[PDB]
Amino acid sequence: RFVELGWIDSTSPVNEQITNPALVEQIYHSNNDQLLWSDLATANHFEAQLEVIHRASFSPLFSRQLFALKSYRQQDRWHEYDVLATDTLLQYLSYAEQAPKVGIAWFFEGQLDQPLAPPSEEAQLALHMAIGNQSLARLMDEYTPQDPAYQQLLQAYQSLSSIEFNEVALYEQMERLKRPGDPLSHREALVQRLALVNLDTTSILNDVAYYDASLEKPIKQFQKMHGLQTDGVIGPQTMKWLNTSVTERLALLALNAERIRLWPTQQDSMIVVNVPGFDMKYWDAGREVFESKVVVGKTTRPTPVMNTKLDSLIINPTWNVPHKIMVEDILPMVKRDSEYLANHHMEIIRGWSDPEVIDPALIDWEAVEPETFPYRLRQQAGVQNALGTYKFNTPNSRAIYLHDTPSKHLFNNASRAFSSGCIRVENAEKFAQTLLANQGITLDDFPVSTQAIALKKRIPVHIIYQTVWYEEGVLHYRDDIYHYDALALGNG
Numbered sequence: 001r002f003v004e005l006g007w008i009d010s011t012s013p014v015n016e017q018i019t020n021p022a023l024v025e026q027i028y029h030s031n032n033d034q035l036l037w038s039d040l041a042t043a044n045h046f047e048a049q050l051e052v053i054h055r056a057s058f059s060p061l062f063s064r065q066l067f068a069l070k071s072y073r074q075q076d077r078w079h080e081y082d083v084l085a086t087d088t089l090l091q092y093l094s095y096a097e098q099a100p101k102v103g104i105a106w107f108f109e110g111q112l113d114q115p116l117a118p119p120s121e122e123a124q125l126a127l128h129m130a131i132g133n134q135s136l137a138r139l140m141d142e143y144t145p146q147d148p149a150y151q152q153l154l155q156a157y158q159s160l161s162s163i164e165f166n167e168v169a170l171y172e173q174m175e176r177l178k179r180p181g182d183p184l185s186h187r188e189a190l191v192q193r194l195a196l197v198n199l200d201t202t203s204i205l206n207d208v209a210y211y212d213a214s215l216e217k218p219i220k221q222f223q224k225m226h227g228l229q230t231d232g233v234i235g236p237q238t239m240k241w242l243n244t245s246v247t248e249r250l251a252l253l254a255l256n257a258e259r260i261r262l263w264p265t266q267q268d269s270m271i272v273v274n275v276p277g278f279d280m281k282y283w284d285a286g287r288e289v290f291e292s293k294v295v296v297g298k299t300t301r302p303t304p305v306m307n308t309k310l311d312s313l314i315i316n317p318t319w320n321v322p323h324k325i326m327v328e329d330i331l332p333m334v335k336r337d338s339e340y341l342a343n344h345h346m347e348i349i350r351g352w353s354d355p356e357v358i359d360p361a362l363i364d365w366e367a368v369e370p371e372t373f374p375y376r377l378r379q380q381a382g383v384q385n386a387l388g389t390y391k392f393n394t395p396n397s398r399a400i401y402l403h404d405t406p407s408k409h410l411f412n413n414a415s416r417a418f419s420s421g422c423i424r425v426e427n428a429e430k431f432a433q434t435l436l437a438n439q440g441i442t443l444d445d446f447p448v449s450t451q452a453i454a455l456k457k458r459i460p461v462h463i464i465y466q467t468v469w470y471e472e473g474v475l476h477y478r479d480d481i482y483h484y485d486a487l488a489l490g491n492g
């Protein structure tokens, strides 16, 4: 298959690189077979967009086409460049349209490594019009999220890009922890690395030999920006981020900017949990009506990025221990600690369909193998239940949901990856009250027995993974707990 254009030989390598020759030739024929990319500023603008996608590292497709474009350009093969650019712009338009629909597959469950379906007729009309007006640069901009949050990441990207290769000494210290009052060997590298993330360094005193008062606010601001405990102590967590290179920050800005294409913005009614920020928000009628900290899955039992809906609440839930938890976690402890089941208010039941309670005294524990244990565990409802007082049921293929917790001290931690995958909600009682108020449900008598409550209006729940974002006028960075930034960072 060869692109039917006079000024492209059938033997040209672009015939193997073009994903949609039929549509590309029609666009040219509709435009009198004129070149679309003869304005270098327009070529530059599209390569700069592809360079963001390339650095983000989620798309072998776009990386492959960018490398081919740059090669044709280095050789002044502008006719080939022209047709490959036009093909690649159709892929970009499809990417822009498809990201919010299926993009999880490109960022979290795989990569964008195969060509996409052609963009919509609306995109194809906007392209035809843009070609007529030589407004391709504006078209590309219109197919970015029209969202100040996205533009804040791209603005920082553009600032840092201009100083990417300036030498900045690493911050070094002799001891593991440096506290206010301690001598400092590397004050200048420290102040330069605070300045790199746009913190006000103008009141830091020059040539002071120790961690003085003038450094304390900037250090705590740096800690807060990176989600660290704001203890003022320059330890390994603080230094990891101080010593992050501009190249690595640019990778994080690019990947996080492109991830914004995935996430819904409608505030009709939505719940969003950002895993690596360990927080959540609930919007009703276009307003934030609830926010709280959360606990999320341990790195070995990760909370998946997913879309689901909140179908129902259980007030005073029991906990039906999943088979895998029973076998791997609990029964080994039961075998070694004859007070475990009483202490955790856990009953042995014949099965879910047959909740006959069996006294653990009636079982020969010596003979029990967790793997073959034929009964099930059910934790009684109450304030010490692992689900607390509230289960927020969000049915999905990974069996993830939201719940209250008796372990509320964990919300005081800066890093909150403690669960088996589920999301534990701080102020769960307030979340339930707000949900049920908005649904036109309220209990005149608060049950002290288990009660399942169907939502009348199902609420979309978006579990997202955003390690850089803009909020209250500043950028926030978070540790890549599930290693989804790892390929972009280059850190193996």
Ligand SMILES: *C(=O)[C@H](CCC[C@H](N)C(=O)O)NC(=O)CC[C@@H](N)C(=O)O
Residues within 6 Å of the ligand: 322, 323, 324, 325, 386, 398, 399, 400, 401, 418, 419, 420, 421, 422, 423, 424
């Ligand atoms: C959520 O994590 C839940 C287990 C109950 C809550 C837990 N104790 C917590 O750590 O917050 N579900 C799962 O762990 C998934 C288990 C899966 N095998 C299943 O079928 O339920």
